[PDB]
């Protein structure tokens, strides 16, 4: 929970945080690498992704 | 991570002041005033890149403030010395915001992002000051030759209002010495040269012969006048 709150900050400030999304011409929304977690981790990173492209531009 | 981000906020805060921090080491390899900044490896490589683009800001703070103290120490009467005084009092406004958010550091919750917003205006202030300083190292001008270079920067830095306002003020702070040396030559004819600020040198002879070394903010027509 809170680590994902901290993780979106470093991408808001710039380039990626706790894990490494990098792949700016290959986007996979973020890396989390977890499948036993809920599938709403797959969509909260979709809102995380449409802001970092507008930050690097 | 969020405790690791806040100490990279505090270690960067000392980098912007000009002193060398703990996790970010500063080293000049070049004769230019800009020193290199190396961040150490972190437990998360993301923030290490995010702090890495805020290191070009103290690159620009270390650029112009070493220039204005080298200009001040190797003592001149020149307009390049009075140029450095207009840059020094702007450094008072830069150092006073950093101390005000440190009152919020005892209540410490400030971000890598709330700090990132305030540094993009103050990279703007420092990058223009660095790019004036970088032009002055390549130039080696003084007197009216500096006055015409600063008059050209009032032309180019238009479109950004606040980059125009300092480039105006730097020109106005370089001309109020120079046109006072003009006026002190008009009321008596007192030609004093600490390092030949004014163009006209003392010669029966009638040999005041303006110089081609220097020119006022206007063209040679007002220098002949």
Automatic annotation (TrEMBL), chain B:
Residues 9-225 form the Gamma tubulin complex component protein N-terminal domain. Coiled coil: none annotated. It comes from the Eukaryota. It is found in: Cytoplasm, Cytoskeleton, Microtubule organizing center, Centrosome. Component of the gamma-tubulin ring complex (gTuRC) consisting of TUBGCP2, TUBGCP3, TUBGCP4, TUBGCP5 and TUBGCP6 and gamma-tubulin TUBG1 or TUBG2. TUBGCP2, TUBGCP3, TUBGCP4, TUBGCP5 and TUBGCP6 assemble in a 5:5:2:1:1 stoichiometry; each is associated with a gamma-tubulin, thereby arranging 14 gamma-tubulins in a helical manner. Gamma-tubulin at the first position is blocked by TUBGCP3 at the last position, allowing 13 protafilaments to grow into a microtubule. Component of the gamma-tubulin ring complex (gTuRC) which mediates microtubule nucleation. The gTuRC regulates the minus-end nucleation of alpha-beta tubulin heterodimers that grow into microtubule protafilaments, a critical step in centrosome duplication and spindle formation. Plays a role in neuronal migration. Belongs to the TUBGCP family. This is Gamma-tubulin complex component. It comes from Xenopus laevis. The gene is tubgcp2.L. The chain holds residues 209 to 448 of 896 of the full protein.
């Amino acid at each position: 929970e809170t680590s994902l709150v901290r993780d979106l900050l470093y991408v808001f400030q710039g380039i990626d945080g706790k894990f490494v999304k990098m792949c700016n011409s290959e986007n996979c929304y973020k890396v989390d690498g977890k499948v036993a977690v809920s599938k709403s981790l797959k969509d909260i990173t979709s809102k995380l992704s449409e802001l970092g492209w507008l930050h690097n531009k | 991570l969020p405790s690791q981000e806040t100490c990279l906020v505090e270690d960067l805060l000392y980098i912007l002041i000009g002193v060398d921090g703990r996790y970010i080491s500063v080293q000049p390899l070049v004769g230019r005033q800009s020193r290199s900044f190396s961040v150490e490896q972190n437990l998360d490589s993301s923030v290490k890149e995010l702090v890495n683009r805020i290191l070009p800001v103290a690159t620009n703070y270390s650029t112009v403030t070493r220039f204005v103290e080298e200009n001040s120490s190797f003592e001149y009467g020149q307009v390049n010395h009075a140029l450095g005084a207009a840059m020094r009092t702007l450094g008072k406004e830069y150092m006073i915001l950093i101390s005000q958010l440190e009152h919020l550091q005892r209540q410490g919750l400030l971000s890598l992002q709330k700090l990132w917003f305030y540094i993009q205006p103050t990279l703007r202030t420092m990058e223009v000051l660095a790019s004036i300083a970088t032009s002055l190292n390549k130039g080696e001008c003084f007197g009216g030759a500096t006055l015409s270079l600063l008059h050209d920067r009032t032309f180019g830095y238009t479109g950004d209002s606040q980059a125009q306002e300092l480039c105006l003020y730097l020109t106005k702070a370089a001309s109020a010495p120079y046109f006072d040396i003009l006026e002190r030559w008009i009321y008596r004819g007192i030609i004093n040269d600490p390092y030949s600020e004014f163009m006209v040198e003392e010669h029966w002879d009638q040999r005041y012969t303006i110089v081609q070394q220097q020119i006022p903010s206007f063209l040679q027509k007002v220098a002949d006048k």
